[PDB]
Amino acid sequence: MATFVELSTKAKMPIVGLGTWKSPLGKVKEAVKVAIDAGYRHIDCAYVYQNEHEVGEAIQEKIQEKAVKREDLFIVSKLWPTFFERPLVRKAFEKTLKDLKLSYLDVYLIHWPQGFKSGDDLFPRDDKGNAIGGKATFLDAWEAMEELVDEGLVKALGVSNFSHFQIEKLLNKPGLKYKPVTNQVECHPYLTQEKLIQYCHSKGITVTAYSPLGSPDRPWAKPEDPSLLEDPKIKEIAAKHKKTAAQVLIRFHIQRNVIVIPKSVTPARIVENIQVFDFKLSDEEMATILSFNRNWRACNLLQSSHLEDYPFNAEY
Numbered sequence: 241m242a243t244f245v246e247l248s249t250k251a252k253m254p255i256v257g258l259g260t261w262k263s264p265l266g267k268v269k270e271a272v273k274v275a276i277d278a279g280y281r282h283i284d285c286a287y288v289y290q291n292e293h294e295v296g297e298a299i300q301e302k303i304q305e306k307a308v309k310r311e312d313l314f315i316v317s318k319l320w321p322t323f324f325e326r327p328l329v330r331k332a333f334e335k336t337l338k339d340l341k342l343s344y345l346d347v348y349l350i351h352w353p354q355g356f357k358s359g360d361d362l363f364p365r366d367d368k369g370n371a372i373g374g375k376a377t378f379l380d381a382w383e384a385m386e387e388l389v390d391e392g393l394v395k396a397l398g399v400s401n402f403s404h405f406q407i408e409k410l411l412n413k414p415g416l417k418y419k420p421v422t423n424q425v426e427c428h429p430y431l432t433q434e435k436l437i438q439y440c441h442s443k444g445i446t447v448t449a450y451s452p453l454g455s456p457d458r459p460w461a462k463p464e465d466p467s468l469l470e471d472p473k474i475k476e477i478a479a480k481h482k483k484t485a486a487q488v489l490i491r492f493h494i495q496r497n498v499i500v501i502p503k504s505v506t507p508a509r510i511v512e513n514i515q516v517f518d519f520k521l522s523d524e525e526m527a528t529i530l531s532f533n534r535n536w537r538a539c540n541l542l543q544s545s546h547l548e549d550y551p552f553n554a555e556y
């Protein structure tokens with residue numbers, strides 16, 4: 241099996257999960273099926289990925305075939321920032337829950353802190369492709385999301401792409417009902433997030449590492465961009481353990497008690513990515529890997545950088 245990180249709610253969040261961004265229809269269903277078979281219990285989803293209906297199919301299949309029980313699955317989705325207006329929070333969540341064919345979510349995340357123009361255009365933008373903002377804020381969103389927890393439709397709330405300033409704004413809001421259980425952010429040896437992980441952990445907030453393999457198929461990749469999978473120094477450590485680069489990149493987070501959600505639709509890779517509980521990176525190897533920090537992001541979202549709550553201006 242695979243280990244977990246205990247949340248502030250005492251719920252157990254499986255430390256490896258399956259990413260689903262850009263997992264195509266026609267592949268994502270088989271991907272979820274192979275992952276469950278391979279021992280994955282945590283699946284990371286989102287409204288904006290537009291494939292929740294197929295993830296839902298796969299989960300239902302495995303449950304009705306007795307491969308797994310709902311209570312042993314840990315399903316996460318995210319509210320997109322075109323839906324921060326209160327009534328849209330409900331409508332957006334209802335579509336996610338119905339697509340996923342579930343009666344509750346384990347975690348529901350604010351996907352990004354900056355609000356976008358409210359509505360069903362997911363990427364409202366000007367002529368240059370710059371995001372158009374909305375006046376509803378992540379605090380408005382959180383307020384409405386808290387009702388879902390009151391109603392037992394979501395077990396816990398969290399945030400994604402929040403800086404420590406934005407988490408402080410959240411924690412320090414008077415009249416807060418629920419606290420975020422996780423902050424899902426990009427994290428890997430080129431962006432080690434030392435200060436942000438230290439902050440979150442000090443507040444009882446776990447970290448979920450996204451793009452842990454450096455998202456090698458991001459359509460905006462430039463050949464001069466760094467490549468973690470092909471990095472000779474990462475590959476050196478892999479070799480030392482007779483493991484793959486990807487397995488080292490995943491194990492890196494487990495050893496920092498950080499949840500990690502590599503994405504694949506390739507059955508061999510889905511299996512490979514969870515074969516990370518039979519080796520250990522040594523203290524010196526962990527130190528070497530941490531030294532690779534470049535403060536480099538695969539996910540800059542520069543087209544939203546002019547917005548008030550754009551998260552990446554702050555140091556952490």
Ligand SMILES: NC(=O)c1ccc[n+]([C@@H]2O[C@H](COP(=O)([O-])OP(=O)(O)OC[C@H]3O[C@@H](n4cnc5c(N)ncnc54)[C@H](OP(=O)(O)O)[C@@H]3O)[C@@H](O)[C@H]2O)c1
Nearest residue numbers: 259260261450451452453454455457486502503504505506
């Ligand atoms: N909250 C956010 O704003 C946010 C942002 C980014 C990502 N995420 C979440 O985090 C998940 C993971 O991040 P990501 O999808 O950006 O990138 P990633 O997991 O770092 O990398 C995925 C890419 O690596 C390939 N791959 C997977 N396993 C491999 C292996 N063992 N060896 C070689 N290549 C491998 C995949 O190919 P194949 O699929 O073709 O096998 C895919 O092209 C996302 O899917 C999403 O769930 C969240």
Ligand SMILES: Oc1c(F)c(F)c(-c2c(F)c(F)c(O)c(F)c2F)c(F)c1F
Nearest residue numbers: 261286351458459460538539540541542
């Ligand atoms: O959940 C997300 C995701 F998985 C992404 F890859 C992106 C994403 C991103 F943050 C970026 F910065 C990109 O340049 C990109 F192409 C993306 F797909 C994103 F915005 C998300 F909200």
